[PDB]
UniProtKB/Swiss-Prot annotation, chains A, B:
It comes from Triticum aestivum. The keyword Disulfide bond applies. This is Agglutinin isolectin 3. Homodimer, u-shaped. The keyword Cell division does not apply. InterPro entries: Chitin-bd_1, Chitin-binding_1_CS, Endochitinase-like_sf. Substrate binds at residues 10-12, 62-73, 114-115. Disulfide bonds join C3-C18, C12-C24, C17-C31, C35-C40, C46-C61, C55-C67, C60-C74, C78-C83, C89-C104, C98-C110, C103-C117, C121-C126, C132-C147, C141-C153, C146-C160, C164-C169. Residues 1-42, 43-85, 86-128, 129-171 form the Chitin-binding type-1 domain. The 4 sites proposed for binding to carbohydrates (N-acetyl-D-glucosamine) of receptor molecules are on the surface of the agglutinin molecule. N-acetyl-D-glucosamine / N-acetyl-D-neuraminic acid binding lectin. The modification Pyrrolidone carboxylic acid is found at Q1.
Length: 171, 171
């Protein structure tokens, strides 16, 4: 039930702050210093500024490299997160994957939902379980996912460790 | 380390799916049946169509009532989440409070960051850190947050336990 690094990059619900010690809360003692994610009083950085660092909880990374929400962050300049502008990807965008596992639609704009993740889905969290491996033309997955021994893409012990054909397998 | 019911509302980072057993990952196993939050394959209800239960992971709640990210969700109709339209609030909007602990700036709009949580903040995760209770004027917190012994508004055991003057005093 721990957050921050004491829960392995896990996050608190309803925008709650994960204090320096790994607990979910809201208050100066959670959102102050040490805060790891949530509505941290001093917004975490990201993007070009932060060598590419992406914002937790799907916060928009404004054009200055600060995570938040509203006009100033998700508006124009938005570097990442749920921007107000459509995000290109795939063949249209040069193989350009979507960030934060978002699905890249048939039409070429990241998102999540049957629209992006279903039929046509070209990369990201695709609900269409496509077959990978020897029993699938020797195909390999998107996003550098682990192609399971039973020929399916995913992340976690089943797909990544013992059995994993091609992908981010440990061994 | 654990999510859903076995984590305390906890969420996986980068949209990872949280299976019914309380574990984080991606793949038919985690993203399928029993998905608790994350980039599910089985997109969750919200707003009007769901008794008003916002989307986890900060997804936009489309007009039709399903959780996602994309022009179809965040865009027109958007009932909640990082909508592409400004969500009014505070003294202006009849007194309304922001959704998912969002800060309501001085101008009457929902967001998160200096601009919203800095000065002028009417409700939510406001960093203004103003006191409460007996200690000064006897004022009480926004969002039913708990007010600690040394009059500090917050949520957690140290604000809601003993010496909690007003709010969600967990005691
Ligand atoms: C949106 C954002 O990243 N805000 C940052 C802020 O960025 C500086 C930026 O602020 C705009 O509002 C101004 O219009 C622009 O000219 C710049 O001054 O930087 C502070 C810290 O310096 C952050 O707390 C904000 O979140
Ligand atoms: C954006 C959204 O909520 N998608 C839902 C989907 O609702 C789509 C919506 O499409 C309109 O064009 C139709 O007029 C309307 O009847 C709806 O079908 O609903 C499915 C399942 O009901 C969900 O999987 C999507 O997430």
């Amino acid at each position: 039930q721990r957050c921050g690094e004491q829960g392995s990059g896990m996050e608190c619900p309803n925008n709650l702050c994960c204090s320096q010690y790994g607990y979910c809360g809201m208050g100066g003692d959670y959102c102050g210093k040490g805060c790891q994610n949530g509505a941290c009083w001093t917004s975490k950085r990201c993007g070009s500024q932060a060598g590419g660092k992406t914002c937790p909880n799907n916060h928009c990374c404004s054009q200055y490299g600060h995570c938040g929400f509203g006009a100033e962050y998700c508006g124009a300049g938005c570097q990442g997160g749920p921007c107000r502008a459509d995000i290109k990807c795939g063949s249209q965008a040069g193989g350009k994957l979507c960030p934060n596992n978002l699905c890249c639609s048939q039409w070429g704009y990241c998102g999540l939902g049957s629209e992006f993740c279903g039929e046509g889905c070209q990369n990201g969290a695709c609900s269409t379980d496509k077959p990978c491996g020897k029993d699938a033309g020797g195909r390999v997955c998107t996003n550098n996912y682990c192609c399971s021994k039973w020929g399916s893409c995913g992340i976690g012990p089943g797909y990544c460790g013992a059995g994993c054909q091609s992908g981010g397998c440990d061994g």
